[PDB]
Write an enzyme that holds these catalytic residues in place. Structure first.
Site, PDB file in Angstrom:
ATOM      1  N   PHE A  26      61.242   5.060  76.748  1.00 21.23           N
ATOM      2  CA  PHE A  26      60.373   5.255  75.603  1.00 21.23           C
ATOM      3  C   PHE A  26      61.154   5.672  74.339  1.00 21.23           C
ATOM      4  CE2 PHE A  26      56.585   8.026  74.033  1.00 21.23           C
ATOM      5  CZ  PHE A  26      56.343   7.176  73.041  1.00 21.23           C
ATOM      6  N   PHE A  51      62.124  10.310  65.906  1.00 20.77           N
ATOM      7  CA  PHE A  51      62.453   9.793  67.229  1.00 20.77           C
ATOM      8  C   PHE A  51      63.236   8.494  67.087  1.00 20.77           C
ATOM      9  CE2 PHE A  51      59.063   6.549  67.635  1.00 20.77           C
ATOM     10  CZ  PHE A  51      58.205   6.973  66.603  1.00 20.77           C
ATOM     11  N   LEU A  59      52.754   2.329  68.099  1.00 16.25           N
ATOM     12  CA  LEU A  59      52.969   3.335  67.068  1.00 16.25           C
ATOM     13  C   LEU A  59      52.915   2.775  65.649  1.00 16.25           C
ATOM     14  CD1 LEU A  59      55.832   5.329  68.851  1.00 16.25           C
ATOM     15  CD2 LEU A  59      53.376   5.732  68.853  1.00 16.25           C
ATOM     16  N   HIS A 114      53.287   5.970  62.617  1.00 14.21           N
ATOM     17  CA  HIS A 114      54.613   6.616  62.412  1.00 14.21           C
ATOM     18  C   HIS A 114      55.365   5.743  61.484  1.00 14.21           C
ATOM     19  CE1 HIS A 114      53.978   9.524  65.666  1.00 14.21           C
ATOM     20  NE2 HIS A 114      53.278   8.553  66.183  1.00 14.21           N
TER      21      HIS A 114
HETATM   22  N1  LIG Z   1      53.738   9.877  71.416  1.00 21.68           N
HETATM   23  C1  LIG Z   1      54.948  10.002  70.817  1.00 21.68           C
HETATM   24  C2  LIG Z   1      55.278   9.241  69.701  1.00 21.68           C
HETATM   25  C3  LIG Z   1      56.522   9.360  69.073  1.00 21.68           C
HETATM   26  C4  LIG Z   1      57.428  10.241  69.566  1.00 21.68           C
HETATM   27  N2  LIG Z   1      57.154  10.994  70.636  1.00 21.68           N
HETATM   28  C5  LIG Z   1      55.959  10.953  71.328  1.00 21.68           C
HETATM   29  O1  LIG Z   1      55.744  11.675  72.326  1.00 21.68           O
END
Ligand SMILES: NC1=CCC=NC1=O
EC number: 5.2.1.8
Length: 165
Positions: free
Chosen positions: A60, A113, A122, A126
């Site tokens: 991930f 991230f 996402l 994001h």
């Molecule tokens: N759901 C998430 C999106 C982006 C980074 N970390 C996560 O746990």
């Protein structure tokens, strides 16, 4: 002109692992790229040097940037407050994408991230603002210290960081 490049020198329980460098898309998301750049040089008096990757989920992403609370509950931007989602022009296309972590619309701080897969769900949530340029193998090595629930099995730190060129 040309997009800035920043690096992170990663350590694992205090032992050097390697360097990851990023291209920051200042041409597309200038405010977001600038925040990460400045946090990486430390020029405002605070930023990522010495901070940890506190949440790593294999397959991930690896998440970091909480330099104030070290656990996902902190961090701060260079702007004196959380900042807006600049745009969602760039998408989560695959491994190496650098994106902002957040707690909802318009709440960007310092957490970010690095994707280790395509994470299209996402998109629009994001802000993508860079990508790994060199040392994706080092991100792959970090990813191995994660787990299903995100807890790391060794302490993963940004031993040094800065801007290249
Ligand atoms: N759901 C998430 C999106 C982006 C980074 N970390 C996560 O746990």
């Amino acid at each position: 002109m040309v997009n800035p490049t920043v690096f992170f020198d990663i350590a694992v329980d205090g032992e050097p692992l390697g360097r990851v460098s990023f291209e920051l898309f200042a041409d597309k998301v200038p405010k977001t790229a600038e925040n990460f750049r400045a946090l990486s040089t430390g020029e405002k008096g605070f930023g990522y040097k010495g901070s940890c990757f506190h949440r790593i989920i294999p397959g991930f992403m690896c998440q970091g940037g909480d330099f104030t609370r070290h656990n996902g509950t902190g961090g701060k931007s260079i702007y004196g407050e959380k900042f807006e989602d600049e745009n969602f022009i760039l998408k989560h296309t695959g491994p190496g994408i650098l994106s902002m972590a957040n707690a909802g619309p318009n709440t960007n701080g310092s957490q970010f991230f690095i994707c280790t897969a395509k994470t299209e769900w996402l998109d629009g949530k994001h802000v993508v603002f860079g990508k790994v340029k060199e040392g994706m193998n080092i991100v792959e090595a970090m990813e191995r210290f994660g787990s299903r629930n995100g807890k790391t099995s060794k302490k993963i730190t940004i031993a040094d960081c800065g801007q290249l060129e």
